[PDB]
Design a protein around this ligand. Sequence first.
Ligand SMILES: Nc1ncnc2c1ncn2[C@@H]1O[C@H](COP(=O)(O)OP(=O)(O)O)[C@@H](O)[C@H]1O
Ligand SMILES: Nc1ncnc2c1ncn2[C@@H]1O[C@H](COP(=O)(O)OP(=O)(O)O)[C@@H](O)[C@H]1O
Ligand SMILES: Nc1ncnc2c1ncn2[C@@H]1O[C@H](COP(=O)(O)OP(=O)(O)O)[C@@H](O)[C@H]1O
Ligand SMILES: [Mg+2]
Ligand SMILES: [Mg+2]
Ligand SMILES: [Mg+2]
Lengths: 66, 527, 533, 526, 48
Amino acid sequence: FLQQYRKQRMEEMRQQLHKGPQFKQVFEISSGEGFLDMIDKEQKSIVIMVHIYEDGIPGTEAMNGC
Amino acid sequence: MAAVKTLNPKAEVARAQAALAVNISAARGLQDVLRTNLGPKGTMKMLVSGAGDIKLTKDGNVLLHEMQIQHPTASLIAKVATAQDDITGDGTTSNVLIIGELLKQADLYISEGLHPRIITEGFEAAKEKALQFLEEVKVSREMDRETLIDVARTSLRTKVHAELADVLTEAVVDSILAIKKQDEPIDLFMIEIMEMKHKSETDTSLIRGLVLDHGARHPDMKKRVEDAYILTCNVSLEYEKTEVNSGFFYKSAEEREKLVKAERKFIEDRVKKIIELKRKVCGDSDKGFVVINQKGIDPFSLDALSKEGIVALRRAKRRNMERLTLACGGVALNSFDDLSPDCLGHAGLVYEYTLGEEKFTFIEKCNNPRSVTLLIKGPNKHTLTQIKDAVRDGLRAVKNAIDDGCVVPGAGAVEVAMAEALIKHKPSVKGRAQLGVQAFADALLIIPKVLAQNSGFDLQETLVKIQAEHSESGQLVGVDLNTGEPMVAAEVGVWDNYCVKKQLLHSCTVIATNILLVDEIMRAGMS
Amino acid sequence: ALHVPKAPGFAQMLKEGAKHFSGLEEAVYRNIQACKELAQTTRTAYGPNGMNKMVINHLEKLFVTNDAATILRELEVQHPAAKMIVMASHMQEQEVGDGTNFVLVFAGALLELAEELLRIGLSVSEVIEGYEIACRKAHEILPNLVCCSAKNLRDIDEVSSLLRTSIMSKQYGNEVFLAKLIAQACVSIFPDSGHFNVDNIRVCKILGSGISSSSVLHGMVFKKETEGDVTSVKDAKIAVYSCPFDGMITETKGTVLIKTAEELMNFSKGEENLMDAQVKAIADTGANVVVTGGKVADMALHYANKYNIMLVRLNSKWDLRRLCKTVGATALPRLTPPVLEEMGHCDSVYLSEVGDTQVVVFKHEKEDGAISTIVLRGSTDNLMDDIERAVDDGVNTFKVLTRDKRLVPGGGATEIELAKQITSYGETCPGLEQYAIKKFAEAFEAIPRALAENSGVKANEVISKLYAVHQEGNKNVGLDIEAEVPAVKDMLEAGILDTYLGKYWAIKLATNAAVTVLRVDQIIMAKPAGGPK
Amino acid sequence: RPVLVLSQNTKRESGRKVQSGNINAAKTIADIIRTCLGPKSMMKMLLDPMGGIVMTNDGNAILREIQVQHPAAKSMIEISRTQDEEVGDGTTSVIILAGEMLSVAEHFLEQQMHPTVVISAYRKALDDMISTLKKISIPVDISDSDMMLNIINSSITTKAISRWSSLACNIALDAVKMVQFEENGRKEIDIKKYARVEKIPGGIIEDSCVLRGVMINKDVTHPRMRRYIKNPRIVLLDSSLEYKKGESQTDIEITREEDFTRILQMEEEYIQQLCEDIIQLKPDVVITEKGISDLAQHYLMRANITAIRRVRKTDNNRIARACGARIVSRPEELREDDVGTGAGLLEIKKIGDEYFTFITDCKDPKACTILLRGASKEILSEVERNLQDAMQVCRNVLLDPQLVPGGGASEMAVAHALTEKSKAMTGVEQWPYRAVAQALEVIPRTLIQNCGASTIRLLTSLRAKHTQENCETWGVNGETGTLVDMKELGIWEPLAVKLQTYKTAVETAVLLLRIDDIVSGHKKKG
Amino acid sequence: IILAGEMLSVAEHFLEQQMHPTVVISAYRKALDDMISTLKKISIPVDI
Ligand SMILES: Nc1ncnc2c1ncn2[C@@H]1O[C@H](COP(=O)(O)OP(=O)(O)O)[C@@H](O)[C@H]1O
Ligand SMILES: Nc1ncnc2c1ncn2[C@@H]1O[C@H](COP(=O)(O)OP(=O)(O)O)[C@@H](O)[C@H]1O
Ligand SMILES: Nc1ncnc2c1ncn2[C@@H]1O[C@H](COP(=O)(O)OP(=O)(O)O)[C@@H](O)[C@H]1O
Ligand SMILES: [Mg+2]
Ligand SMILES: [Mg+2]
Ligand SMILES: [Mg+2]
């Protein structure tokens, strides 16, 4: 019954221990020009995931914490 | 306003009496929802999921999980009920009812400026006294078949209607008595619960064997074997590649044919081992040979086995290895290095049943099976799920009654007796914790209240009648759900698990004490 | 003082999109209304005078039929109670194959009368108890109403007469011809062994020549052509291979490692010689037709053409297994010549054109075999689909007859007799359950009422005449369709009969569905969210 | 079109407003958990952004879950974390003390006193605070288990687990004592790695106990394994018991018919040889951090050996410490010293619907598992936090056998001592000296406020009592609001905890008093 | 209001039974006439 995700619970268990110095937050882009000037920088090795959202609508808070 | 709001402007804070009001309102809402579930006369709820799935249910835990609630205190109560269901398997609605009534009674005194700490102290003292009284009142009886049947009734009659509960009582009691070994813990993993969707809900029964949701994959294999030798194996009988990137090289078509022929020799060796063992064991045609493999079997091996009159099943469940070992009586094999008739299981009948696109295999007539299966039958998916939950609760109740050397009278009699004992013990408590003791007793009194209310009778009149009868006679009298008159639960046969009552007391008291001491609820993880 | 706040407790804790219906009026009456509406939608297609309905699903696919199960399947039913009734009807279809509209109508009538009982002061528990008692009484009474049995199943005329009624509700105009076709197809199947397999009957739909040109073929027909040049065999000796008609290769990785010029020169010639030898060995066993489940190699096809071997390629493994059952061969896993036991035989195999469709026909001259095929003609795809549904209903009726041979009168006679007997029984028993028992009996009137409504006559006069005749003593009398005025006639004489098992299972399932719907008291619907399927 | 010296999103604040904002932010941080100090504290519910719920009255747990934008609050949070990491207790006390010292420093900042003078006075005060705490301390005989139990009880009497005080104290003391270790002349405790706390929801808290060994959530690989062994010999491994590819590319080339079968047979023979090398030492249990092949399972079963696979590395280390084994990677190098003899029982039993492996009868185990059973996950998490506090206090006492009176007695004694010493300053630093000395009265004041009694009269009486000669142990009863000698109430705390709290609070005040300009908005500029 | 609701409720049964509403209306009017007659019959006098 490996497909029932027995290891999922313990994965959450040791994912709870984030770090010592707080846990920070998710960065927010102020403007489209800001988006462009933070996106053209850095190197290829850096992987970026970006989330579009609005307040109140379902699903944003859960995956934001994720 | 608040300090947290000053530090985090977009924060939600509930301080001082606001936190108590929020928690008590949430608990009272949950209690109001779950009042109509207690007892066999409780109403049945239908829950529709997002995808449109229909689920008829009456369990407290199932209702809590599939009820659209997004409250913190509700989350804590749901976690407590989840633990209660996980360990004991019963007493989930009673947990929520007792927590809610505890909080309401505590609020009734807190609203007069009383600090919650005094109420918590009274709760702890009352819990200790109630635990002592429960130890005093339990009935230590040798668990024969009649007592187990009575306990299974007291569970399933609440879970399902009358005749279905009557069938399930015999089913679960017989299954537990079949798998139970003297002076050993009961392994509930050995009762495989199978679902079929082709008959009425009362056609569910117990099979003294095993039922597999998969059948033979070769059309030429026999559909029914009278006398069977069971070979439980965990060997990949299909084609497997070399781990070190073998690859083939040839210079002609004939060489390619030779390589193709010789590439399956490794599998054909163990197939020949199986065939030779079968031929040695049963040289006649009376006795059949059944092979159950946890790993797959390629069509070549299937044909080679079927040519010898051997029925083989592939991709069996992992727990089915132990289930077949305990039921048929063989030895599970991870390799055919040295296999002998001593490792072969025995089954007095093996036949395959077909239901639409799904094929089922029955392995019955075992000598003394230590692992049986329950076949759930019904015309609907929601009916199957409801019967599944009822059977789970009944099995847990019977196992708890077997493990515990005692059993507790039901119908709310023990709650009434605990409340009266707590009232009598109240003067012994020093200080204002007597108020907490009284609140705890009144909270314990909720079960007969809810039972009488669900049965349709008057609440206060029925409770006062029960209390007067218990006080004047000293017996353990509970609520009769048909007439409302006092009834002796022990004589009638309304039984409750001692472990369930103890867990209820402990968990409810702990969670109520923790909730009552909360003075602030915060959410400042943003910005 | 201009806004009503949500009540404290569960009302406020409920999620944003969820709904909570509790109590009698908010839940039970609404569920009964939804079931009544569903029964109303399906009602008009009941009986021989039922009307087809064009139903277009979410994929713009058109279904025209009067089959209740098909109409329910292709309707986007959303209400939970209606979903429960629909799945009860589908369960009835799975168990028996006919009576789905009976299940719907009976459940709707039962729930309507349950609502009527609840409005006058009865309780849900008492109504459920009365319904269960009346259902047990009906199941006890039903065996006593059996008028005749099958008494034979290998006969053609008797089986056709028995199956006429089942396929008369659908295709009222022309049921005798369809009855003859299905009777022949079922008699070909069902050997001396008592087992009868529904899957052994195949339906082939070839458009063009009207349904009256349909026929039954003792064998199988495939909608494809032949790979080779041979297109007809008179003494077919099919050899069936599950493997591709090509030289088998290794499973890990092949590599023709050439190290000298001579090996490169000889490799292709050797491979061709091996293929030729294999095909010649196959042909030397007398086999003249080869059926493969895989692709066909060019070299193998050329050598089969050289040796005059007919090649048929079957895509589906189900088709391969069915062909093996029909011809009597064994699906070989390699390209070895077949031994005598695995040597399929057939009377004739040829490539033929029907309308504009090229088909391959495996035909047996003998009146035997394991699989029989019905070739359906017609001028429309939807018409042929409806005819196929009728054929499936007839085959399921034949299967039920094999399981149980008892027959009860049709045409509303059985329902009227059940209603009369249940009312008579309920008059005896005192207590509050007598109202529920009487309502359960009255709910049986919805079948003759539906038949009268669909036939265009006055239902009340028909029901009154039925009660008069049944009180006289004739329990085998139902309404007469072939009459523009309310009239009744003996159903046994007219041979309008339906299976006892169908009635038993339909009544049981309808009662179970109605009781289960009534048991529900609270509805907690989550947010609809997604769930495309 | 704008010239600009700095970036348009760079904001600068300077002057008195910066100091006022910093001190107000520190005071707000103090006010967050002002009411969570003392035996009569109240719980707080924290809603984790990940959806979890934290219910606690511990200062560090409360502060960690709060996201703040004012960076002085960030400094305070870091201070709380530092206090929690260093000693494990005194987390609320350090925050409250830092807030009080920053308030009394703002008092002088209202006047024309430079912050450096206040900082120098604070550092002199801190030195004298350390001296006074060292003076009024008393020694402890660690061999007296009753004294250790009383110390742990005084440590955990202010938490939820205080109801089951004796049970919690015994669990913590036993765990710390059996985890204590010494090797190669080095003495260590290492509570963080060993002494794992495993919580299983359900049951009753009274059933919780510290196991004489290690328990893991694992089951036997094969059903026919033995689930109950009397005196097992445990062998621990890292390398898997499977057939794995080599590091280098090792493509084969097969041209003969029998080479495929030979390759597969050699795979089987290699597995058999590995299993035989394991079997040679005749063990009873084999534990692997990685997978075990089915053929390896069969070969071990042929020798009647119980095999468990995919065990975490930390759990394997804990088992090695408990049963006295040594983890071995290559089975061919397995030696008798590496076989774990000393485990007195191994049993796989079912709890709820899960299987748990118990090695719980080891003689002289150097690692333990604390099995917690309770109402739910949140209750067990709070119990685990309380147990962590208890074990940290126990290890602090073991490392430093000094104690000082609790319940505000030490605070008042140190305040009086520094006030008396300040009479000879005869300078300008005497005022901040006296202010920071008297700021220690916030702990007794907070205790009285949480108790609900009258602050002014009780605190005046406490000060008057402390003005006498032999009264350094006179604190305040936190649950009755009356003055009482703490050598009768028996509430004591480790000297290390008080020293760390005082030092951290004073350094926090010093750090926040040195800031008079805030620049924000600039990019990281990596 | 309750009386009208009940009358329409009991009429719906006949409208669903292939009965034209005019017959129901005629029966309702006859019933109303007889109701008025019966009410006038069972009345009692009162001296003001
Ligand atoms: N036949 C009966 N007569 C009277 N009381 C009953 C009967 N059956 C069960 N009960 C009472 O109902 C309670 C069980 O309620 P139940 O719905 O099972 O709640 P939970 O699922 O939380 O245990 C028991 O405390 C028992 O005393
Ligand atoms: N010639 C006929 N005269 C009267 N009734 C008939 C005749 N033929 C069929 N029926 C009735 O039609 C009913 C079948 O309805 P049908 O449309 O098949 O619904 P279902 O498919 O759900 O069974 C049977 O109960 C039968 O009594
Ligand atoms: N029984 C008691 N009476 C009075 N004061 C007490 C008592 N027990 C503990 N204290 C005081 O409470 C403080 C512990 O409070 P606590 O909630 O643990 O704060 P922290 O988490 O910062 O240590 C100690 O400084 C001690 O002086
Ligand atoms: Mg229960
Ligand atoms: Mg029909
Ligand atoms: Mg502390």
